[PDB]
Design an enzyme around this catalytic site. Structure first.
Site, short mmCIF file in Angstrom:
data_model
loop_
_atom_site.label_atom_id
_atom_site.label_comp_id
_atom_site.label_asym_id
_atom_site.label_seq_id
_atom_site.Cartn_x
_atom_site.Cartn_y
_atom_site.Cartn_z
N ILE C 365 0.86 -1.26 -0.07
CA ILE C 365 -0.08 -0.03 0.02
C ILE C 365 0.89 1.43 0.05
O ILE C 365 0.28 2.44 -0.13
CB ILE C 365 -0.84 -0.02 1.37
CG1 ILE C 365 -0.14 0.18 2.52
CG2 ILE C 365 -2.02 -1.00 1.22
CD1 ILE C 365 -0.92 0.35 3.69
N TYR C 366 2.03 1.20 0.56
CA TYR C 366 2.75 2.28 0.92
C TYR C 366 3.43 3.30 -0.41
O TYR C 366 3.91 4.32 -0.09
CB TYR C 366 4.22 1.95 1.70
CG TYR C 366 3.57 1.14 2.79
CD1 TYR C 366 3.37 -0.40 2.87
CD2 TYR C 366 3.19 1.84 4.05
CE1 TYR C 366 3.00 -0.93 3.99
CE2 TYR C 366 2.53 1.00 5.18
CZ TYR C 366 2.63 -0.31 5.07
OH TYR C 366 1.95 -1.08 6.32
N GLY C 367 3.56 2.90 -1.38
CA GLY C 367 4.10 3.67 -2.44
C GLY C 367 4.50 2.68 -3.57
O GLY C 367 3.78 1.69 -3.65
#
Ligand code: F43
Ligand SMILES: C[C@@H](OP(=O)(O)O)[C@H](NC(=O)CCCCCCS)C(=O)O
Ligand SMILES: C[C@@H](OP(=O)(O)O)[C@H](NC(=O)CCCCCCS)C(=O)O
Ligand SMILES: O=S(=O)(O)CCS
Ligand SMILES: [Cl-]
Ligand SMILES: [Cl-]
Ligand SMILES: [Mg+2]
Ligand SMILES: [Mg+2]
Ligand SMILES: [Mg+2]
Ligand SMILES: [Mg+2]
Ligand SMILES: [Mg+2]
Ligand SMILES: [Mg+2]
Ligand SMILES: [Mg+2]
Ligand SMILES: [Mg+2]
Ligand SMILES: [Mg+2]
Ligand SMILES: [Mg+2]
Ligand SMILES: [Mg+2]
Ligand SMILES: [Mg+2]
Ligand SMILES: [Mg+2]
Ligand code: NA
Ligand code: NA
Ligand code: NA
Ligand code: NA
Ligand code: NA
Ligand code: NA
Ligand code: NA
Lengths: 548, 247, 442, 442
Positions: C365-367
């Site tokens: 999800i983070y980048g």
């Protein structure tokens, strides 16, 4: 006798910590927890008030099929649910950040030279004290020259002030002591001598701008706000024209030539100005922490107080909010400051080193790295294998990797007196752990870990740097949890073992030796506990300007 | 190939999982339909969805690499890329996270493998995933007490076992029956209830877990005692360290 | 030459072109085709005339969903493209018949622009390309339609976007392969900040050509960064040759041997065997049923391992015809080869580490995102010094349509314009030809 | 032959050197000496060997007041400077016959380094100069003393500072005239981010040479930025000639006529008279006892007005021997000349505007500083497109010691190294000579 983590494990679970089996699924889910029950009730209230659904335990998967554990804050007797250690829910943690973000260090050396050489006027301890009275009125946001100025409410900005320090005792003694950080009071004798010799006859200001402003604004505000009010106070106290060409020299000195930011600005992908967490090098974080001046006969305590400081700031606030957000990264960080676990492993390593080499007496080489980091890694991993409650406590491989390697790297640095071989030991720990358990951390945990061994001793442009100088913007370190705060600890470790007064910047060390801070940097873990219990009183609140 | 150093049973088991000439021991029979049900990407009898046209219907660029590298069947058809994910208990599950990813990239073509502490995943074209998944579920990659098929809510690799010797599952996808001694899969890997559960066999006994496991532990075979494996890891650390400095 | 090594040069069909060429004939510092590619990428701009026209007619200028009601201007730019392009070329050139090029494409909807080299000989950097191009086209459009002083600022907004309020040319209707200098992660990084999808677009998804372009860009940046200086220079050059230029046909032959039925593991076995056969590695010590390999030339082991890494990507992601598993190949090729040999993996672990983070930031999800949005300037993928990104380009070239953020989605204007330039499209051809031409000058 | 204009070129003593030079022979795009100056500024680095040695001996690395106890290394770097510099040069150069220069200064305490042009021919920008230089010196020091693997990272910190944790080379013991590409206010600005004090240092406080160097840099940036393309090219060229190169001896003669007793206002009166005498302006309308002037050549009026502005600075700040009032001269020269004539001031008000903000930010609490810390990339002084900063350089050249942040304070390393380069120190001479040499190629 007992390992240091045993009391915490006995508090968490009905079983002795050695037991391999337990009971799940019949604990009532979220209903087992006082805190989750508080949240369920608050979510219903919030949703009704605002007309939009919010917190609801029935969304997604059902928490609490296993024990929702209490955590002991390490070195304390305080036990709290982990939600009380989330930075959002913990005012102590928010104030710790605010106190760093709102600080800058600004010399008076160039300023005094402008006064003497360009204006032709005298600077003495009397004129300095007058200037300091003036700047302590002006810095919170109050006027000294113009008619019809409107001002900040003093009580909203009660936390902002200016102090000075200098290595010259005789000069320090002549300035009103309300304004002075007294190095001889705050540090033990041998540390005070080192710090005074580093500063010499330099005179430095420690400026703290209001928390309410830092929260409304950003970290890059701090040095600007500082410089404006230094500038006004120089005008008032030294009888300049209020705005002549010389006034610009004071501006450039205060904003550029003699300023020390807590953090440097960041590149565009993670764009941020000065005084944000990613710009704070590991050596500065170690020096901000004040454990060194109070716990100096216990290098493990000093180093692990630094790790607590950095794991919270760097993983919870920085990586877990500035760089991501949401639920975030509380337990990635709490692994490093709860249950006395990292403490047990690091005391083990210190004792191993003390008995084999003597602190700081091992050869600074790869043989020492291979010996100490391997021994300590195997000890820590054996504890997870011998105590199933310990493994269920630090349930994520990343948490375990960080804790074991932190002990390994700090212990290696205790042996060599050098942070760079401590860093090599951190990476070796990772490699051994990975092979032992056929797992390490989360999907992306060992990016820096696999680049790590080769980059410890590189000298190439964006690779080579002493660990003290590295920070969250060192390229390999820019993304991932479970490393940055631990690296601050490894930076501290050889200096603590050596008895050094500071790790990287003596001015930063002295600047946080100040009882007028809101957060108590001499006892970071104690303060985290206080905040968890809802007993910490932060600055920056707006109660005075809002309805009852 | 020699795969992995060391003189323990753990080391030999790691080598055997990676070696495509080692015949994985088949422990249980699962139907094709039951694999599809556990996966949960399509219903039995449902045509494979597509993400692009069959390769035969597209004009591919003139490219010697394309000509030399045979696409897997699901690539030829244009299938979705889908997954299967497993969690392995630290209490002596036969396979473990890095063992799986290492073995998958030795044994299987066209594979995206990911290793984490609590989960290990393979992604590949759907029809090919089904065939791999059958082997992952039927063989000694899988024990129904100490391993779990889990696409979400993976917690349990590091937890204590329950009274039946089953790993924790927040979603209870695998149920042990005390009266029968067998485990059934009652939900697919993402947690939705199955129409009809899938028998997964009996859990392996303790002695067989110890023969088959690939984790080192003090109460099995400790890594520190597998000195030749440790030596190689230390060698790699030193050589990487020296190489980064000067070559 | 500084170094003794020679390589045999092959083409993208695996056929020998030239035997026994000095390694430094492939150096960015010496090879004239690498110089042409770099200088070409500095000076080339794609202009979207249709986009400019549509922005003006709708007053949709200055970034996503932006519009200024009442500012519409109805100008037939594409219908008058020949006149506008000629007028712009008069302003862009320094002298008549210099190396300025302005070429219409797509019936006047697009233009290829190459700003004269003389402008860059007296420039610090490369921003003269978009800036000179933009102002010439702005002025040419104003002059073509006699746009009033009151309205001409809209033409400027339609061409260059929200600059200078934004740092970037936000909403611009011109594009370059390079991005603005302010976005560099460090000094020296500009040739790294070229999206993988742009490289795949320019090379028309030809796997070997994409890998070559990417390697040339990455390794050229390593010179600008100072990484390929002194002790490390030979390692960098050998990596360019063996991983990116198919030196000795090693990549090609490993793919040939493993393409029908092979895996990452089977490519590793073949590479280790070939390194032994060639004397690059030798048995150093015997443990229990385990041979520990050593080398007296770590840079050459690294280059052999890097060739194998490229081949393993081509075999694994080629078999899937799906790029996503490149992150996994970059990790486990390296992890597996270390335990197979007792020698360090490619870039001494830095490819493996890049791959760990790249895996994470392409599956979380983070980048990050899909493979095609990465580049050597990306924080996730900057860590390996040129040995990881070229495999990502090869993987994306091999993808048959599994990606949402594909080159068709991110890089269409780059594809139409930059694929026209022969040395951008087929760099393996031109760099090999140039290396053979200069082989006795090295 | 794009433009018909010719100028007469003079030296810094007011003697005619070459008559009737086509304007375009002074263009940055054409003049080989401007090219040489820009390429030289891109490639030249100052190395403080004494500073590196002292940083290592004290472990004071990584920025102000920083120190790492226990990391001290005592190396005889200055004493072994010839060997170290020769070893560095071997890494820096591409071939033995190239244009690499490595020269010891100050008995070995300093080195002048010019990195070879061939590195820049395959680079996007200019950061190869500091980065190649830094790693060559780091590696040469390590090799000279056999510094261990365990300690070599301190040598790196002593040379390049806290980079890459800091974006800049924070604490470095190398310097360039240019700054890192991330600090550009806009694309195309790199030649503007050169501190005024650095120009005054390089030119040894020779007022007309400082003005010339600054004008060459600023106007060359105007080309890179695209400002000098199309409609505005001639205006920029004429400003380079008349303001920075003393074309037609106009600056010099205004100074001569006003230097003994003159003021800004007396310079204005003489410039207006001269513009009338030359037919650049003429009376357009008569009001009540007031003549409104007009012109058929705004670019030439602007160039005359800019020459006057430079002469007014030299007269006003020269009379005080104090640079601070340059902000006032830049403001009121322009304000006064508009009410004297009815014509727009230099750069159509942009010098006046720059001067308002510059005056504020050199006499207030808010930012800025003394004149010498400004530059064309500074937010305060970027606004005029080349017509303001050269006057600041003239004024700081004339300062007799009134400034705290003087060139002695900010630019000593730059002074020692860059003033050795003849074309940096005496650029007017070289540009005039090159213009004469190419006059028949225009
Ligand atoms: C969806 C992802 C993928 C992704 O990009 N991030 C996730 C989810 C994310 C969410 C989960 C919040 C929620 O449940 O809604 C948050 C809290 C970040 C956020 N958005 O606020 C998070 N992870 Ni994750 N995540 C964690 C961890 C982990 C461990 C958990 C292993 C186990 O056995 O339980 C594994 C990685 C691994 O296997 O090593 C993991 C995976 C994953 N992590 C898998 C979901 C796993 C699952 O299906 O159960 N996290 C940890 O290892 C401990 C700390 C913990 C974080 C919260 C905290 O620090 O308090 C949290 C940090
Ligand atoms: C990679 C990059 O994201 P992008 O690829 O630019 O979207 C970067 N994020 C991060 O590095 C996230 C770090 C914190 C969350 C993961 C912790 S392991 C950023 O937002 O600038
Ligand atoms: C000029 C510049 O300051 P420096 O010259 O860089 O110190 C800039 N300040 C400002 O522009 C201050 C603007 C607000 C105060 C004046 C309002 S009229 C800044 O801090 O970045
Ligand atoms: O599961 S992932 O490793 O992608 C994220 C862990 S929080
Ligand atoms: Cl070599
Ligand atoms: Cl004109
Ligand atoms: Mg009991
Ligand atoms: Mg029990
Ligand atoms: Mg005095
Ligand atoms: Mg007090
Ligand atoms: Mg008092
Ligand atoms: Mg069957
Ligand atoms: Mg059935
Ligand atoms: Mg084979
Ligand atoms: Mg063509
Ligand atoms: Mg000597
Ligand atoms: Mg020579
Ligand atoms: Mg040596
Ligand atoms: Mg007169
Ligand atoms: Na208990
Ligand atoms: Na036990
Ligand atoms: Na829930
Ligand atoms: Na960003
Ligand atoms: Na209130
Ligand atoms: Na041409
Ligand atoms: Na020859």
């Amino acid at each position: 006798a007992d390992k240091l983590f045993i009391n915490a494990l006995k508090k968490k679970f009905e079983e002795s910590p050695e037991e391999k089996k337990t009971t799940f699924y019949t604990l009532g889910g979220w209903k087992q927890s006082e805190r989750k029950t508080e949240f369920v009730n608050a979510g219903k209230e919030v949703a009704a008030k605002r007309g939009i659904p919010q917190y609801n335990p029935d969304i997604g998967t059902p928490l609490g099929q296993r024990v929702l554990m209490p955590y002991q804050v390490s070195t304390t007797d305080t036990y709290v649910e982990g939600d009380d250690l989330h930075f959002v829910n913990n005012a102590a943690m928010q104030q710790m950040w605010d106190d760093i973000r709102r600080t800058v260090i600004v010399g008076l050396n160039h300023a005094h030279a402008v006064i003497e050489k360009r204006l032709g006027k005298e600077v003495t301890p009397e004129t300095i004290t007058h200037y300091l009275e003036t700047v302590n009125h002006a810095m919170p946001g109050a006027a000294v020259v113009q008619e019809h100025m409107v001002e900040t409410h003093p009580a909203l900005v009660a936390d902002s002030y200016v102090k000075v320090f200098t290595g010259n005792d005789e000069i320090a003694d002549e300035i009103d002591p309300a304004f002075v950080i007294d190095i001889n009071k705050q540090f033990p004798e041998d540390q005070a001598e080192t710090l005074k010799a580093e500063v010499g006859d330099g005179i430095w200001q420690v400026v703290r701008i209001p928390t309410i402003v830092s929260r409304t604004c950003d970290g890059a505000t701090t040095s600007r706000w500082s410089a404006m009010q230094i500038g006004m106070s120089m005008i008032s106290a030294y009888k300049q024209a209020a705005g002549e060409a010389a006034t610009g020299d004071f501006a450039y000195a205060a904003k550029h030539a003699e300023v020390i930011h807590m953090g440097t600005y960041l590149p565009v992908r993670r764009a941020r100005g000065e005084n944000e967490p990613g710009g704070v090098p590991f050596g500065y974080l170690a020096d901000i922490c004040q454990s060194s001046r109070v716990n100096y006969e216990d290098p493990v305590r000093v180093s692990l107080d630094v790790v607590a400081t950095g794991a919270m700031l760097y993983d919870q606030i920085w990586l877990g909010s500035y760089m991501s957000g949401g639920v975030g990264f509380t337990q990635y960080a709490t692994a490093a400051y709860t249950d006395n676990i990292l403490d047990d492993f690091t005391y083990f390593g210190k004792e191993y080193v003390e008995d084999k080499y003597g602190l700081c007496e091992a050869p600074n080489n790869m043989d020492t790295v291979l010996d100490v980091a391997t021994e300590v890694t195997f000890y820590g991993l054996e504890q997870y294998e011998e105590y199933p409650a310990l493994l269920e406590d630090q349930f994520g491989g990343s948490q375990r990797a960080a804790v074991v390697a932190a002990a390994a790297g700090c212990s290696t640095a205790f042996a060599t007196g050098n942070a760079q071989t401590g860093l090599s030991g951190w990476y070796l720990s990772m490699y051994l752990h990975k092979e032992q358990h056929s797992r390490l951390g989360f999907y992306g945990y060992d990016l820096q870990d696999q680049c790590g061994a080769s980059n410890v001793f590189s000298i190439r442009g964006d690779e080579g740097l002493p660990l003290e100088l590295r920070g969250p913007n060192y390229p390999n370190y820019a993304m991932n949890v479970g490393h940055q705060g631990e690296y601050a600890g490894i930076s501290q470790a050889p200096h603590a073992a050596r008895g050094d007064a500071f790790v990287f910047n003596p001015l930063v060390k002295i600047a946080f030796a100040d009882d007028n801070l809101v957060f108590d940097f001499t006892n970071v873990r104690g303060e985290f506990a206080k905040g968890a219990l809802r007993e910490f009183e932060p600055a920056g609140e707006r109660a005075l300007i809002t309805p009852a | 190939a020699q795969y992995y150093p060391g003189t323990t049973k753990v080391a030999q088991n790691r080598r055997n999982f990676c070696n495509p000439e080692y015949e994985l021991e088949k422990l249980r029979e699962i139907s094709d339909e039951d694999v599809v049900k556990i996966l949960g990407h399509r219903a039995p009898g449902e045509e494979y969805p597509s993400v692009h046209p069959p390769l035969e219907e597209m004009d591919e660029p003139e490219d010697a690499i394309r000509e030399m590298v045979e696409p897997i069947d699901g690539a030829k058809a244009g299938d979705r890329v889908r997954y299967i994910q497993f969690t392995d208990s630290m209490y002596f599950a036969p396979a473990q996270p890095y063992v799986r990813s290492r073995a998958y990239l030795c044994r299987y073509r066209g594979a995206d493998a990911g290793t984490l502490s609590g989960r290990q995943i393979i992604e590949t074209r759907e029809r090919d995933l089904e065939k791999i998944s059958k082997e992952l579920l039927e063989t000694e990659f899988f024990d129904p007490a100490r391993s779990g098929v889990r696409g979400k809510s993976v917690h349990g690799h590091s937890l204590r076992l329950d009274e039946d010797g089953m790993m924790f599952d927040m979603l209870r996808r695998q149920i042990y029956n005390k009266d029968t001694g067998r485990v059934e899969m009652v939900k697919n890997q993402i947690g939705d209830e199955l129409d009809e559960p899938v028998d997964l066999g009996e859990p392996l006994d303790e002695e067989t877990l110890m023969e088959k496991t690939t984790i080192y532990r003090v109460d099995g075979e400790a890594y520190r005692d597998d000195v030749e494996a440790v030596e190689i890891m230390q060698r790699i650390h030193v050589l990487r360290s020296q190489g980064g400095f000067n070559l | 030459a500084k170094f003794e090594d020679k390589v045999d040069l092959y083409d993208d069909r695996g056929n020998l072109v030239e035997e026994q060429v000095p390694l430094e004939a492939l150096s960015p510092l010496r090879n004239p085709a690498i110089k042409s590619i770099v200088q070409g990428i500095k000076r080339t701009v794609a202009v979207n005339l249709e986009g400019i026209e549509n922005a003006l007619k709708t007053a949709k200028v200055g970034g996503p969903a932006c519009k200024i009601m009442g500012r519409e201007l109805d100008l037939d730019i594409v219908g008058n493209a020949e006149s506008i392009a000629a007028a712009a070329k008069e302003m862009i050139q320094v002298t008549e018949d210099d190396d300025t090029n302005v070429e219409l494409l797509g019936g006047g909807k697009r233009a290829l622009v190459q700003v004269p080299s003389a402008r860059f000989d007296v420039a610090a950097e490369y921003s003269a390309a978009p800036l000179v191009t933009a102002t010439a086209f702005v002025q040419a459009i104003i002059n073509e339609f006699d746009v009033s002083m009151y309205d001409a600022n809209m033409v400027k907004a339609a061409v260059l976007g929200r600059y200078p309020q934004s740092v970037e040319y936000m909403g611009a209707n011109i594009a370059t392969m390079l991005d603005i200098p302010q976005k560099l992660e460090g000094p020296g990084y500009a040739l790294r900040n070229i999206m993988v999808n742009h490289v795949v677009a320019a090379t028309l998804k030809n796997t070997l050509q994409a890998a070559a372009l990417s390697t040339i860009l990455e390794q050229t940046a390593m010179f600008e960064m100072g990484d390929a200086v002194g002790a490390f220079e030979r390692m960098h050059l050998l990596g360019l040759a063996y991983q990116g230029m198919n030196a000795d046909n090693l990549v090609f032959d490993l793919v040939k041997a493993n393409g029908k039925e092979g895996t990452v593991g089977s490519v590793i076995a073949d590479l280790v065997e070939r390194a032994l056969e060639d004397g690059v590695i030798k048995v150093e010590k015997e443990l229990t049923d385990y041979k520990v390999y050593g080398t007296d030339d770590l840079a050459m082991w690294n280059a052999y391992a890097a060739a194998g890494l490229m081949a393993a990507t081509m075999v694994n992601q080629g078999a899937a015809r799906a790029a996503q598993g490149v992150s996994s190949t970059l990790l486990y090729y390296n992890d597996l080869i270390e335990f197979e040999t007792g020698l360090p993996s490619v870039d001494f672990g830095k490819v493996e580490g890049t791959a760990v983070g790249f895996s994470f930031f392409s599956h979380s999800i983070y980048g990050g995102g899909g493979p095609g949005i990465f580049n050597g300037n990306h924080i996730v993928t900057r860590h390996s010094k040129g040995f990881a990104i070229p495999c990502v380009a090869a993987a994306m070239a091999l993808d048959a349509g599994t990606q949402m953020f594909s080159p068709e989605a991110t890089s269409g204007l780059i594809k139409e314009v930059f694929s026209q330039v022969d040395e951008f499209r087929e760099p393996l051809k031109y760099v090999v030809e140039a290396a053979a031409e200069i082989k006795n000058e090295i």
